[PDB]
Amino acid sequence: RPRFSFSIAAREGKARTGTIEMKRGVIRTPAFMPVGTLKPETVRATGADIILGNTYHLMLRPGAERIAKLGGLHSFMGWDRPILTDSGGYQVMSLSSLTKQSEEGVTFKSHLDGSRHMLSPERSIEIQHLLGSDIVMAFDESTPYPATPSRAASSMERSMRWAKRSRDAFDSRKEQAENAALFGIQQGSVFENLRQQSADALAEIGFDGYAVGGLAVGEGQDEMFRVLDFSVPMLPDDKPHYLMGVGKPDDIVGAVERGIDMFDSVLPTRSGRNGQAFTWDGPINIRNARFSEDLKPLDSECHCAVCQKWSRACIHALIRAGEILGAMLMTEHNIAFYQQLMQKIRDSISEGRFSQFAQDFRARYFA
Amino acid sequence: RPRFSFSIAAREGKARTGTIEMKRGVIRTPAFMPVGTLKPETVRATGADIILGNTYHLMLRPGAERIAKLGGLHSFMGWDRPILTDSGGYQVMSLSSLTKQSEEGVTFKSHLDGSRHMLSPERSIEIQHLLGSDIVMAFDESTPYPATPSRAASSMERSMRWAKRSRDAFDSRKEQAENAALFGIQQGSVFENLRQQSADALAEIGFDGYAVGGLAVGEGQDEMFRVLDFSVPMLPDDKPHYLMGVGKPDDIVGAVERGIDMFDSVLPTRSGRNGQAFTWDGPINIRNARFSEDLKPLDSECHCAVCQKWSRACIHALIRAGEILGAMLMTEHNIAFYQQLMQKIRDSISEGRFSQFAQDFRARYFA
Ligand SMILES: CCNC(=O)CCC(=O)c1ccccc1
Numbered sequence A, B: 001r002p003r004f005s006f007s008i009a010a011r012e013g014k015a016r017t018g019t020i021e022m023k024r025g026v027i028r029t030p031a032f033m034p035v036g037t038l039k040p041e042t043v044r045a046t047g048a049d050i051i052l053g054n055t056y057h058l059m060l061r062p063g064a065e066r067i068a069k070l071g072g073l074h075s076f077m078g079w080d081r082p083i084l085t086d087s088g089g090y091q092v093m094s095l096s097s098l099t100k101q102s103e104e105g106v107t108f109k110s111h112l113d114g115s116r117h118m119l120s121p122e123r124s125i126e127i128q129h130l131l132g133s134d135i136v137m138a139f140d141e142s143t144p145y146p147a148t149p150s151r152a153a154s155s156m157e158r159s160m161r162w163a164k165r166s167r168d169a170f171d172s173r174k175e176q177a178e179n180a181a182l183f184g185i186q187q188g189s190v191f192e193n194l195r196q197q198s199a200d201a202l203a204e205i206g207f208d209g210y211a212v213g214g215l216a217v218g219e220g221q222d223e224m225f226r227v228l229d230f231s232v233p234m235l236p237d238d239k240p241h242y243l244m245g246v247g248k249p250d251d252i253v254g255a256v257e258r259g260i261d262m263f264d265s266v267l268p269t270r271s272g273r274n275g276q277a278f279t280w281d282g283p284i285n286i287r288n289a290r291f292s293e294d295l296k297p298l299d300s301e302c303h304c305a306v307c308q309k310w311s312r313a314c315i316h317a318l319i320r321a322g323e324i325l326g327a328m329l330m331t332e333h334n335i336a337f338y339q340q341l342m343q344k345i346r347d348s349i350s351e352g353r354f355s356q357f358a359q360d361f362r363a364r365y366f367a
């Protein structure tokens, strides 16, 4: 298998389906990447081809150098397929404190114990190498929503300078350059001209894939879709398009309709722990008393192991009682549901009926 | 398969190994029963033949009548093998409040919400029927340690009256009498003459098995073993002997040396959640920093899935981080370890080398 090869097998409108080949395995697209930071065998059994690791959390605990000493993230976790790592920059903004930003990078205090850390394009790429990830994200500077044109431009411009530094750092490390892939991140908030400048800058540097950054941070679905409408066509058509941090099932479907190939979200796992199960008829909160004697599975069609074996009433009782097993079952079902969604998306594009699937999905999900 | 058949296949001193046949399966003895109130398939994979359910917890949440409406405990949990239920009486003493005791039974307030409940010989047997358990424990009155001769005698005498009421309640319910088994509980604290009176009373009533009650409540191992020395021989030799609430690995080995056939304890699960792993070289606390880079499994010989796949360093990191997956792995290993202990006990009795096993076990476990 090659270091990186993205092939598009079928298209419908702006939607694409195909594969990314990498040394550690094949990724079917459009892809959903569960956030890994359940046993790895269970994550694989649900259908995941690749998982996401959070550089920020991993650099705090157990630490990047420690994971490297212990053989890298794949060996440590027992997941032998591709891993994508984020750059750490977003969680520095959202979770750390005492942050000091500069053109060089950022220094920050851990949210766990106030120890001091730093990230930069060079250090982020280095940490992602120590972890051994297969898809490395360039380190950028996040832009809050809403942002003024001036601040969005300044952050996009710095992010593009940092994208070049990320590229050069990755290329300088032979083991990483030869075995991993590097994605760049488009910025520019909701502003078309800035999105175009960013896309142009990233394509001139050249990356293995292109993320749409800066969305899913408060703008609402209508605005997110409007920005995707003009932003995704700016990116190279022949490389994967990754919408970071999205999202809800309906967000995923609409983003695929607009040309997105890859997704990650904490929602399946966070929802699982807080009683929310995804179903083809919309989310349900299993803690609700209406489920206390409901013998049906979480979802009537889901083929996951939880829905084959246990009732809503059982899971309701476990969750009511605070039992860890309840969170395990909810999480396995939700991740499995997300993978079944992606499989239906891939199949419907391959068969030229994705537009109809999206319409049918929405009618039932929002009934 | 019969309702109940206990066969002894081999003996060494006071130790016995054999089988209990019941409608839902065969129980290998000496047996350890994990407390079920991990997925049932995982509990089975570790080697458990039977699990324990706590009547007190189940009658509070989700409730006995609800479990019956939903098809009984086996169907609700997805465990199709034997289940033993305790009577609820011990947890009323240790966990409930506003308790009002009388010759009829006890009324108490839930520790969860102050709702009012009652148990009695008749109601305890009824609840155990609603749950569908296979081995039903008679309802008795617990005796704290230390207890005066007078109080130990009074509680033993009431417990024997309650044992007759439990027997009659069980026998009156045809479905229960024909398909389940009933165990009586010997009381009498540390007093030989009271233990003998209790044994005589229980044998005169007649039960399918006999528990040694009132131990593992503060007396210390030396005293527990001294009481077992004279108490177990008082019980019918041809029926199973069950030491309730025991215990640590070394307690189990010594109790088998004194004629005990069955055991339950929360320790494997409670220890799993609080960082303690059982090994043939004694317990370890995986949270200790000495394990942060330790690539060995929890135990060098254990054949459980956790020890085949993950390192001490991995589990250390999960537990340090409060991750539910860490508690899952520790619990699976600990229950598996307990089952491997029982298997080594059974094999060594069958081969006439249990005395040597007990000596070898203790030398290494306490090294
Ligand atoms: C059962 C999958 N094995 C593990 O999780 C081992 C430990 C590990 O991979 C990890 C990753 C991030 C933070 C803390 C620990």
Ligand SMILES: CCNC(=O)CCC(=O)c1ccccc1
Binding pocket: A310, A313, A314, A315, A317, A318, A321, A325, B037, B038, B039, B040, B058, B061, B062, B076, B077, B078
């Ligand atoms: C995965 C095994 N299935 C379950 O646990 C279903 C729910 C159940 O059996 C239970 C028992 C006691 C208290 C609360 C729930």
Ligand SMILES: [Zn+2]
Binding pocket: A298, A299, A302, A303, A304, A305, A306, A307, A308, A333, A334, A336, A337
């Ligand atoms: Zn499911």
Ligand SMILES: [Zn+2]
Binding pocket: B298, B299, B302, B303, B304, B305, B306, B307, B308, B333, B334, B336, B337
């Ligand atoms: Zn093990």
